[PDB]
């Protein structure tokens, strides 16, 4: 990357102003005479001691142990930006009470305890407590800064050749937070950086500004394509979260100091609007944040399969050759992707008239293999009087505008292009209607969508994005809205895929740019990575930092986007991607073709093995995503989420968990002969799912590997459902029987869940047509019961096999299910591995049943 195109904090004039304010006595003070305790909030005036500017603090306790702090000007010349459409609801409030008061202090109790907020008047300060434990302090280092709107690089400012007219002058806001007891913080994606965030004191702050960084590099805090202003703090004793609800350019400083971490947020405009999520457990934080910005959209089953992509597949014949290549080489695949060369000169919603002349027939041939297709649709519209999309958007005034009232024009893939104003609800509705089968001619129900370049990328723009003084719906500047522009694209696209179906089909949309709330609209990926071993390694901490902030449907380009991976790296990347949520191979225009059958047989076989393991685990992946959708719990997890008291896990990022059942340590080094796998948990056992060898935790096990090894361990006490009949795509598999893998705890117990529905509609929600089963093992009995009785489903899926790890040989196996005579099952048992296989239970998955080992 050429770093000179992108501002450092010093080159960002508001970052330079804010960051020059160093820790010290704050000039802000609360006028306790103005304090009012309102019906859902507390309001009190703040004043700058020197400027005498008057601010208003709106302090709120919220249900589910959360506090919200909002600060705005008392009498602004013009209203400041407050972020819309990100919060899924008005957060339910909890009542504040004054429980203490002196000359310089007011203590507030939230509802009836145990949470208390101490407002200090001079200097202005907030402390948050659970009883007498101090959880968090606000403005403890005096870094609060609120530039008031003055009379219309502090004003006019230039970077390279681009001039920001800056008609409103300095308006930046900033605020600090002190986390006593915390030494590990996480989150604020997206950065090609480690899971555990580094202190910024001697360098750049972490930057949050959706930007298109060409050939981005590793281990640095430059802003990448998406921004989620959510920071998580973990210690042995508690978990906390900070949600800084601002859409403008934001810099984040992190400092360490009895152990304590301080966090400072610095944003260019808008109000101060921050949520304090008090835990105490990390799953409490997940729930708290989920109640604010929603949960992960339930992906249609096919989108959890394998995606085959590149820039670019040539033509319909090429797409069909790729399709047939998967079947001829016995490799599963659900979706083939069409990048920008499938359209007419990068006019989106069109098809190249020579190379894609009959898209319906291409889509019909894919439907006959029960596979899907994804087409790219970017949000920049070619300036072209013959382009109907451009004419309609121009005629209806739905483009982003410059200050002089003309439509903004930049440069992108089709050359000169304009940018629809997706902050305008009328534009988003137009966009969604454009995906109807009549408007998007050539599309069909098995065609889904990829939104790229939606930061927005502008090739001739400052930092390769839109001018700060472009103008959006309701007069707001682009500097106000920048970081939710991509989310609005992702949202309008996803709604369009729903509406074109009459509200029945679940969408699938991959998006490059994102914000808080993007989890509600589909998937994201880490952009243009590189075919190198270190880029393979960094996919884990990048997707883990996205998982912690609610974006569970994450992945990285398998094989790397830039450059050509050596076959061994490609094999290891398939094994890595096979255990990450979003699983797509993608490649740059000038790379050699790397469809997985083009390699020598030894590499083909290891890739096929990784693809089979992924397809077998789809019932498990699907259930984890249903839990993500209902509860807000991440699918891919850091080990410290499952072992919060094991401080040796707080920084691990070459290992991760899927739910609570599977621990993954993929090989990520060329020519490796083994890996060091940390198996955590006291009194915890782990099963090598390839050899069935049981290992007790906690230990670091040295595990030898070959080209075909994917180090995966099942936790004792868990039950993992698999489809052992791998077919060519997931649609072919979704009525097939389930095999249950029971990993016995040392106490001889195990538990697990399973979600099932039709695989693609909202019927699970609108008609309660689904199954949520609970499987539980204790004593010597495996029992299937309903984990949600409201769910019923017509399905042929049955239980064809049970594999129990850690069991002795029984004398007899007996199955009982309601409505059937008591049955005896035959079994096989290996005394070396203590693996018990129950043959063909033959019971419907919708039925209660029990199996007893005598």
């Amino acid at each position: 990357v050429d770093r000179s195109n992108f501002k450092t904090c010093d080159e960002s004039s508001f970052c330079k102003r804010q960051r020059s304010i160093r820790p010290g006595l704050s000039p802000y003070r609360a006028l306790l005479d103005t304090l009012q305790l309102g019906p859902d909030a507390l309001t009190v005036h703040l004043i700058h001691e020197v400027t005498k500017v008057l601010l208003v603090l709106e302090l709120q306790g919220l249900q589910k142990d959360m506090t919200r702090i909002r600060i705005d000007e008392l009498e602004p010349r013009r209203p400041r930006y407050r972020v819309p459409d990100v919060l899924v609801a008005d957060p339910p409030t909890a009542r504040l009470s004054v429980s203490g008061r002196d000359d310089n202090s007011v203590e507030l109790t939230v509802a009836e305890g145990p949470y208390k907020i101490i407002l200090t008047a001079q200097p202005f300060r907030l402390d948050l407590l659970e009883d007498r434990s101090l959880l968090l302090s606000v403005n403890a280092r005096g870094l609060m800064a609120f530039e008031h709107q003055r009379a219309p690089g502090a004003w006019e400012e230039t970077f390279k050749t681009h001039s920001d007219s800056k008609p409103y002058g300095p308006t930046s806001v900033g605020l600090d937070f002190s986390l006593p007891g915390m030494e590990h913080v996480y989150g604020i994606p997206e950065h090609a950086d480690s899971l555990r965030l580094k202190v910024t004191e001697g360098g750049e702050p972490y930057r949050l500004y959706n930007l298109d960084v060409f050939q981005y590099e590793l281990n640095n805090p430059m802003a990448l394509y998406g921004s989620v202003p959510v920071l998580l703090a973990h210690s042995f004793h508690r978990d906390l979260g900070i949600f800084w609800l601002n859409a403008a350019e934001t810099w984040v400083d992190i400092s360490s100091n009895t152990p304590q971490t301080d966090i400072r947020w610095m944003s260019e405009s808008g109000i101060i609007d921050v949520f304090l999520m008090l835990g105490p457990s990390v799953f409490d934080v997940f729930r708290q944040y989920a109640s604010l910005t929603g949960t992960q959209a339930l992906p249609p089953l096919f989108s959890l399969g394998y995606h085959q992509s590149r820039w670019n597949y040539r033509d319909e014949a090429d797409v069909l050759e790729v399709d047939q290549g998967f079947d001829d080489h016995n490799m599963p695949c659900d979706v083939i992707w069409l990048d920008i060369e499938h359209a007419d000169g990068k006019r989106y919603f069109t098809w190249d008239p020579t190379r894609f002349p009959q898209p319906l027939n291409m889509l019909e041939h894919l439907a006959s293999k029960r596979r899907k297709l994804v087409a790219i649709v970017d949000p920049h519209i070619k300036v072209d009087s013959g382009y109907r999309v451009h004419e309609e958007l121009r005629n209806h005034g739905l483009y982003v505008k410059t200050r002089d009232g003309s439509d903004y024009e930049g440069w992108c893939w089709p050359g000169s292009a304009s940018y629809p104003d997706f902050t305008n609800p009328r534009m988003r509705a137009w966009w969604s209607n454009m995906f109807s089968f009549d408007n998007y001619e050539g599309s069909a129900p098995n065609l889904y969508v990829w939104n790229d370049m939606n930061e927005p990328s502008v090739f001739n723009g400052p930092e390769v994005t839109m001018l700060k003084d472009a103008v959006h719906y309701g007069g707001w500047e682009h500097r106000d809205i920048h970081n939710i522009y991509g989310l609005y694209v992702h949202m309008a696209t996803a709604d369009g895929l729903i509406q074109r179906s009459g509200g029945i089909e679940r969408p699938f949309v991959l998006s490059r740019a994102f914000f808080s709330g993007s989890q509600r609209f589909g998937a994201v990926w880490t952009g243009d990575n590189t075919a190198e071993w270190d880029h393979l390694k960094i996919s884990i901490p990048m997707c883990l930092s996205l998982a912690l902030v609610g974006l569970s449907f994450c992945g990285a380009d398998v094989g790397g986007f830039f450059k050509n991976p050596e076959p061994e790296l490609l094999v290891r990347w398939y094994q890595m991607g096979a255990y990450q949520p979003f699983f797509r191979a993608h490649a740059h225009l000038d790379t050699g073709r790397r469809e997985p059958w083009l390699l020598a047989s030894q590499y083909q076989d290891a890739i096929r093995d990784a693809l089979f393991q992924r397809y077998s685990l789809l019932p498990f992946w699907y259930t984890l995503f249903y839990q993500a959708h209902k509860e807000g719990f991440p699918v891919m997890r850091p080990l410290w989420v499952q072992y919060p008291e094991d401080m040796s896990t707080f920084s691990i990022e070459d290992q991760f968990m899927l739910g609570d059942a599977l621990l993954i340590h993929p090989v990520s080094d060329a020519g490796a002969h083994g890996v060091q796998v940390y198996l955590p948990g006291q009194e915890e056992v782990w099963y090598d799912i390839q050899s069935y060898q049981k290992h007790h935790g906690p230990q670091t096990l040295y595990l030898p590997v070959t080209l075909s090894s994917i180090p995966v361990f099942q936790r004792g006490g868990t039950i993992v459902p698999r489809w052992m009949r791998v077919r060519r795509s997931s649609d072919c598999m979704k009525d097939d029987p389930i095999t249950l893998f029971v990993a016995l705890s040392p106490q001889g117990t195990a538990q697990g869940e399973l979600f099932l529905d039709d695989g693609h509609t909202f019927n699970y929600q609108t008609r309660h047509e689904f199954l949520l089963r609970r499987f539980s093992f204790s004593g010597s009995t495996l029992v299937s019961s309903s984990a949600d009785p409201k769910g019923h489903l017509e399905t042929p899926i049955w239980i064809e096999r049970v594999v129990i790890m850690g069991a002795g040989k029984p004398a007899a196996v007996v199955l009982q299910t309601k409505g059937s005579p008591e049955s005896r099952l035959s079994f096989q048992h290996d005394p070396e591995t203590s693996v018990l296989i129950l043959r063909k239970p033959g019971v419907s998955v919708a039925s209660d049943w029990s199996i007893h080992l005598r």
Partner: protein, 87 residues
């Protein structure tokens, strides 16, 4: 009255009763007990395909909803009705 005999896997790994032949569960390590279902990972399904060449397909493609035999016999209980195309 006299009775019936059992089935022996073609690899010789086992002998099972004939009511476990094509019972939709894999009992032979070579897949030979399920020539008519999708139960074995290493099995094969024989397309007779009168009017064209006969063909073997993977067991995983029996009732996957995709027409693999030109005579359509691989899809007999999947919801996909295949037409004869051996012409």
């Amino acid at each position: 009255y006299e009775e019936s005999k059992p089935f022996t896997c073609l690899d010789g790994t086992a002998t099972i009763p004939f009511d476990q032949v094509n019972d939709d569960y894999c009992d032979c390590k070579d897949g030979s007990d399920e020539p008519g279902t999708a139960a074995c990972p290493n099995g094969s399904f024989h397309c007779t395909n009168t009017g064209y060449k006969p063909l073997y397909i993977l067991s995983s493609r029996v009732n996957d909803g995709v027409c693999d035999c030109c005579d359509g016999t691989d899809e007999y209980n999947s919801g996909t009705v295949c037409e004869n195309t051996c012409r």
